[PDB]
Ligand binder design. Structure first.
Ligand SMILES: CC(=O)N[C@@H]1[C@@H](O[C@@H]2O[C@@H](C)[C@@H](O)[C@@H](O)[C@@H]2O)[C@H](O[C@@H]2O[C@H](CO)[C@H](O)[C@H](O)[C@H]2O)[C@@H](CO)O[C@@H]1O
Ligand SMILES: CC(=O)N[C@@H]1[C@@H](O[C@@H]2O[C@@H](C)[C@@H](O)[C@@H](O)[C@@H]2O)[C@H](O[C@@H]2O[C@H](CO)[C@H](O)[C@H](O)[C@H]2O)[C@@H](CO)O[C@@H]1O
Ligand SMILES: [Cl-]
Ligand SMILES: [Cl-]
Ligand SMILES: [Cl-]
Ligand SMILES: [Cl-]
Ligand SMILES: [Cl-]
Ligand SMILES: [Cl-]
Ligand SMILES: [Cl-]
Ligand SMILES: [Cl-]
Ligand SMILES: [Cl-]
Ligand SMILES: [Cl-]
Ligand SMILES: [Cl-]
Ligand SMILES: [Cl-]
Ligand SMILES: [Cl-]
Ligand SMILES: [Cl-]
Ligand SMILES: [Cl-]
Ligand SMILES: [Cl-]
Ligand SMILES: [Mg+2]
Ligand SMILES: [Mg+2]
Lengths: 310, 310
């Protein structure tokens, strides 16, 4: 009897589910060549999170661990959950919220989080994580911080990391669609969230974009995700059973109260639209509108085209 | 017709409303000597945010602005909203999400956010904000970053700031209850969220704590808030009319499904309990329980004592 719904927050007050940033756009990208397989911001409509998705906004693209000394003044990190609870292999692709950008450098700022170590002095460690490096093994709970400052940190120091910015590899652009290689062999329990394949009926996947310090990106400083973090939190909170093959949403103007565009959101946890031919689809719509659940529909419900013709 | 409710997320997956951190405790402190007047994490039960409270998790304790040169190689900042929209004086105490810690230094990490300035190079600016400094004027839209690195940033650079850590002033401890002096004279529209006074009936205010890099604090690295950010977002989303003088909550074990403790949440947006005499009140309860709305009650409903006797 719990009926389905989406948060009725304006798009531009909701946040990305792959970096901790405001959403400021939605886009389509039909003719781009990458698999769609983000591990963060993945949640079914009845509230089952997939991949490494956490419900917690403050865990999105964070990681935590304890220091040990690796060769050549590199800083090894034994991962834990951001909560401090232990992380064990063979159960998920990586700890909850663990960043899912594999195509470039993570410039990280960390702080000590042990209260006894926070009575005095600078608690910051900065450095650079290279997910394409051969010592990147997040599924088994270990990674390396290159070029740390301070360059010597006592073994066993508990550190909470944020990604201050992302950057391209040398002579490439940073593609924010590329997920990391989590390493190992994932058990069936620890499987990646599946890849999303393009839906039929002239539909294309809608991405919720944030401006983010992703330097040298293929997108010009924009990080895409499939669901606002508030959508993830809403579905986990609600646990509304799936009662149709897709959910029709209207994107409503808050001023005029009128329908700006039709969208479908699929049980697997992704949004589509039909772009008006020869235009940017939903990208030209105002960003202060609100998504509203209309009804369940079947997969073959035909959406009215959204956006302008160019 | 819209009935009241609280998010049914476990305490330890929700987040602070004054810093972007997981909640990991709830405490009482009936005897601490400060006024209770946070400006973030303030929301009525029918969903009106107060002070500088934003609904957006990724705006909590952030600020944004454009650089100008101040005397003695200080970095002046003309504030904007985190969304980039202009901030005008005389309407709120400070921009939405603006940090509300007045008793110590804010060690900040900023990045450029203009996409054209993110095609290449290091976008980071770090420095220190001193809210007790005479050039701290957030209501009128301006503040100063002391000791910036780089020490010269082009005028007009758009910067998004996070607080990496907080620290005590010299020869003092950092009290996280103290809010900034926002300056000026606040118009009636721009008024601070009111102070909360101790309730009757043996009740005391419940604080939701996070471990946070607050160095040299009176709390030993713990930041208190009145409401989890998810509660704020829930009330704004729901807009459930107030239908009683207080809302009785139970804090339910997710395993045994039994009631761990009775709490009241008041229309003004704060939680209370009655601590069992001579103990820490709710602090000893497991942090993985879930708050559930029982009913509206009057102010004189008498809560069963929570916690152990010591
Ligand atoms: C041992 C010593 O004096 N070290 C100082 C730093 O002071 C210590 O660390 C800070 C974080 C604070 O806890 C102080 O009480 C400690 O004694 C000093 O840090 C500055 O300290 C002032 C207050 O004394 C403010 O908190 C600043 O924000 C801190 O940066 C640094 C830099 O001056 O110098 C020595 O390491
Ligand atoms: C003009 C120049 O060569 N500057 C380099 C930096 O490279 C530029 O900035 C980075 C962020 C990237 O956009 C490069 O494509 C630019 O040319 C260099 O930064 C490192 O660059 C590598 C890739 O070249 C990675 O992105 C690293 O993560 C960056 O730190 C710095 C440090 O090596 O040196 C000069 O400033
Ligand atoms: Cl039904
Ligand atoms: Cl809805
Ligand atoms: Cl979670
Ligand atoms: Cl400790
Ligand atoms: Cl993998
Ligand atoms: Cl457009
Ligand atoms: Cl249909
Ligand atoms: Cl009624
Ligand atoms: Cl209802
Ligand atoms: Cl109503
Ligand atoms: Cl409830
Ligand atoms: Cl807001
Ligand atoms: Cl630009
Ligand atoms: Cl009443
Ligand atoms: Cl205790
Ligand atoms: Cl009563
Ligand atoms: Mg899992
Ligand atoms: Mg206001």
């Amino acid at each position: 009897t719990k009926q389905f719904s989406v948060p009725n927050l304006p798009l531009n007050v909701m946040s990305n589910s792959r970096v901790p940033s405001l959403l400021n756009a939605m886009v389509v990208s039909p003719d781009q060549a990458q698999v769609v397989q983000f591990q963060n911001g993945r949640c079914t409509l009845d509230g089952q999170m997939l991949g490494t998705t956490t419900v917690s906004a403050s865990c999105v693209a964070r990681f935590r661990g304890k220091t040990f000394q690796a060769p050549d003044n590199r800083l090894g990190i034994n991962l834990a959950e951001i909560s401090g609870e232990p992380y064990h292999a063979f159960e998920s692709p990586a700890p909850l919220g663990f960043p899912d950008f594999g195509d470039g450098d993570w410039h990280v700022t960390a702080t000590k989080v042990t209260p006894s170590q926070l009575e005095a002095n600078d608690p910051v460690v900065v450095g650079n994580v290279q997910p394409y490096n051969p010592q990147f093994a997040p599924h088994l709970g270990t990674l390396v911080v290159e070029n740390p400052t301070p360059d010597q940190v006592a073994t066993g120091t508990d550190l909470l990391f944020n990604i201050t910015w992302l950057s391209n590899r040398a002579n490439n652009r940073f593609n924010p669609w590329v997920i990391p290689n989590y390493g190992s062999t994932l058990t069936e329990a620890a499987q990646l969230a599946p890849s999303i394949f393009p839906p039929g009926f002239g539909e294309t996947i809608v991405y919720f974009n944030s401006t983010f310090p992703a330097v040298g990106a293929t997108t010009h400083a924009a990080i895409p995700c499939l669901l606002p973090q508030e959508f993830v939190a809403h579905f986990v909170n609600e646990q509304a059973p799936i009662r149709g093959e897709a959910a029709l949403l209207h994107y409503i103007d808050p001023d005029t109260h009128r329908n700006l565009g039709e969208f479908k959101i699929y049980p697997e946890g992704f949004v589509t639209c039909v772009p008006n031919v020869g235009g940017t689809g939903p990208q030209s719509l105002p960003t202060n509108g609100v998504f509203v659940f209309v009804s369940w529909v079947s997969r073959y419900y035909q959406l009215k085209p959204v956006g302008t013709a160019g």
